[PDB]
């Protein structure tokens, strides 16, 4: 599972993502809404437009919840609980969308952090997000 050393590539890769986390979480929403339009279904109350303050405001939230998974990573279940009831009970997000957002998120770490983003770290980040999504879908299962 999320080995002693994957736990280290994520605490580091997010480490240098620092100040920007909110810009990045919003860049990756924009990417998901653009590339896989079937996800727009859930945000009818958003301006899914480029300048949109809502997507830019939501980038902050997705990035806050990723951080609170990076720190407490040895215990995702407890930390992400109310987001794993919001998405799974309240909202009913099709769990295949979690794969997509995880992917755009990686295309965003890539596009902003080339030297960090070594193949081993691509693996770690992917393993990390695959656990966030597993937590986020766990009422479902």
């Amino acid at each position: 599972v999320l080995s002693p050393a994957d736990k280290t590539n994520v605490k580091a890769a997010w480490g240098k993502v620092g100040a920007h986390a909110g810009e990045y979480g919003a860049e990756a929403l924009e990417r998901m809404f653009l590339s896989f339009p079937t996800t727009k279904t859930y945000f009818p109350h958003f301006d899914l437009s480029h300048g949109s303050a809502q997507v830019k405001g939501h980038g902050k939230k997705v990035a806050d919840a990723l951080t609170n998974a990076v720190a407490h990573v040895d215990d995702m279940p407890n930390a992400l609980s109310a987001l794993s009831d919001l998405h799974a009970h309240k909202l009913r997000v099709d769990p295949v969308n979690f794969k997509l957002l995880s992917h755009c998120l990686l295309v965003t770490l890539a596009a902003h952090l080339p030297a960090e983003f070594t193949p081993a770290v691509h693996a770690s980040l992917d393993k990390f997000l695959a656990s966030v999504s597993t937590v986020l879908t766990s009422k479902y299962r």
Binding site: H103, V107, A110, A123
Partner: protein, 146 residues
Amino acid sequence: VHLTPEEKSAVTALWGKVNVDEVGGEALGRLLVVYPWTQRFFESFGDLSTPDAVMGNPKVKAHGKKVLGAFSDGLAHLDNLKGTFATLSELHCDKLHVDPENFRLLGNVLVCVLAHHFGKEFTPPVQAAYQKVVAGVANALAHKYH
């Protein structure tokens, strides 16, 4: 495929900056590292056990060049995305029995590698077009599970 005139161009104007020889293998390398079940198919290859030994596998860089090759045959023959790949589809499906969702993984990591190399010029609408090309190429290889 559709590729609106304004998607077609962002795609075409990326690829010509693409160092095929060294991108094809950054992708096939990343594939065996992030999604290791794919290694099963490349045991004709050598040491694949630690990520350095893959990204520096002369074989893994060689084979990847064939692979950016068939993306090139697709990226500008989009009219039958189905027909350019018939033989390759015959090669991947009823010869090696590669499950169709690996075809998506590979195109997905290709996009991570396109992003990694071009940084800010891989703007979201310029990504959105590549997810269309890749999804198409992946629908095409898989045409023989039917």
